[PDB]
Design a protein around this nucleic acid. Structure first.
Ligand SMILES: C[C@H](COCC(CO)(COC[C@@H](C)OC[C@@H](C)O)COC[C@@H](C)O)OC[C@@H](C)O
Ligand code: NA
Length: 361
DNA sequence: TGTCCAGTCT
DNA sequence: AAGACTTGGAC
């Protein structure tokens, strides 16, 4: 097993931070910083450790906020880790609330060394309109890291941060940010636009569908964003979403040989889903082929869980074998329970057949 | 609770 | 990525 992520902020890293702080600030209280940062370190998760570094710096540095920021600007290029550098935007969000313009400039600078995606959300929470205006300017910045921040920091449902209830409730607030970026030349930016849009589909699917129905999907950057923005709705079999992908029509196919083997497994074994699709159409057709498992849970069953299989074009009268092995074992993100597990085959949003496997007690 | 979603490794 | 997740938010 690899070391846990929290070990990125181990004592050796804290010593590195202190040494580089001494390099930019000879009078730095490195001993006090280390004492403060190390207290209970083993009990701290990775994001607790990240925050702790910022707090420890604030506790021992006898300078004001602008003066400390000057040191931290010099510290940023000396750090040997982009993830570790998250404590720099954290310091701004913690101590910069009453020095807004300076703090915004600091986040724009620091975000290239890691990411200001967590820090900017504290400002969006406490000063939404003021911060939104800044992020609109950032969406037009020359630097792809700054444009990406504009999209990622404003996400309704960013992992490892609180949801932004104000954004989540009103997709028009950030709409112009995403519109500016819908054909961005940066893959980094495009990923963020797509993920922000996928977030929106959890609460306002029709708004995203209407938006993308207005897009020019002949632009391959925009088409790529559309496919990844709509990925949850596609798995749900949403007809408007599948239609945007060219796979909204009912599949003109027959399914043959559908099976799941073995019929009965112990936890830890693999299942094998296989079937053949035969076109019954006079021309090629675009297909989105997924599958779903109805897992047995501690009580009852979970909602059908959809996994991706294949997206492809099936020639007229052609047939295509499809096969997927899946390793069924307890995982951090899924515990399993014994009984009948039903597997459904999905083609352009339609269930075309099912099979079963038994998970033994 | 248990459950589900979500740049790097795989 | 496409899925799990070293980890975290939320229901
Ligand atoms: C915080 C982001 C993403 O983190 C990715 C890494 C990947 O292992 C940790 O994911 C752990 C996983 C359990 O979580 C899932 C994601 C969805 O949260 C950390 O990256 C390690 C290298 C960079 O040190 O990255 C911020 C940026 C400043 O790096
Ligand atoms: Na990984």
């Amino acid at each position: 097993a690899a070391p846990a992520l929290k070990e990125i902020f181990n004592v050796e890293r804290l010593q590195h931070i202190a040494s580089e702080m001494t390099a930019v600030y000879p009078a730095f209280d490195a001993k006090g910083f280390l004492k403060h940062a190390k207290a209970g370190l083993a009990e701290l998760s990775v994001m607790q450790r990240m925050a702790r570094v910022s707090e420890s710096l604030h506790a021992v540095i006898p300078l004001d906020y602008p003066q400390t920021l000057t040191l931290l600007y010099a510290l940023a290029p000396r750090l040997n880790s982009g993830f570790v550098s998250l404590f720099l935007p954290h310091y701004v969000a913690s101590y910069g609330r009453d020095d807004f313009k300076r703090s915004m400039a600091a986040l724009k600078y620091f975000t290239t060394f890691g990411s200001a995606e967590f820090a900017i959300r504290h400002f969006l929470l406490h000063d939404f309109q003021r911060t939104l205006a800044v992020m609109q300017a950032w969406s037009q910045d020359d630097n792809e890291h700054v444009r990406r921040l504009a999209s990622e920091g404003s996400r309704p449902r960013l992992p490892w941060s609180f949801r932004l209830a104000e954004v989540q409730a009103d997709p028009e607030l950030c709409a112009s940010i995403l519109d500016h970026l819908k054909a961005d030349s940066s893959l980094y930016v495009r990923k963020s636009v797509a993920n922000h849009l996928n977030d929106i589909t959890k609460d306002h699917p029709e708004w995203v569908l209407s938006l993308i129905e207005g897009w020019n999907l002949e632009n391959p950057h925009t088409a790529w964003i559309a496919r990844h923005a709509l990925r949850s709705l596609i798995k749900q079999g949403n007809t408007r979403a599948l239609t945007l992908m060219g796979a909204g029509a009912k599949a003109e196919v027959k399914i043959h040989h559908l099976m799941v083997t073995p019929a009965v497994i112990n936890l830890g074994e693999r299942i094998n889903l296989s079937f053949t699709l035969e076109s019954t159409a006079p021309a090629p057709q675009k297909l989105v082929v997924d599958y779903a498992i109805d897992y047995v849970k501690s009580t009852g069953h979970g909602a059908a869980k959809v996994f991706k299989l294949k997206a492809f074009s099936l020639g007229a009268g052609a047939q295509q074998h499809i096969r997927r092995e899946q390793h069924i074992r307890d995982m951090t993100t899924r515990k399993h329970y014994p009984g009948r597990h039903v597997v459904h085959v999905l083609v352009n949003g339609e269930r075309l057949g099912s099979a079963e496997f038994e998970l033994r007690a």
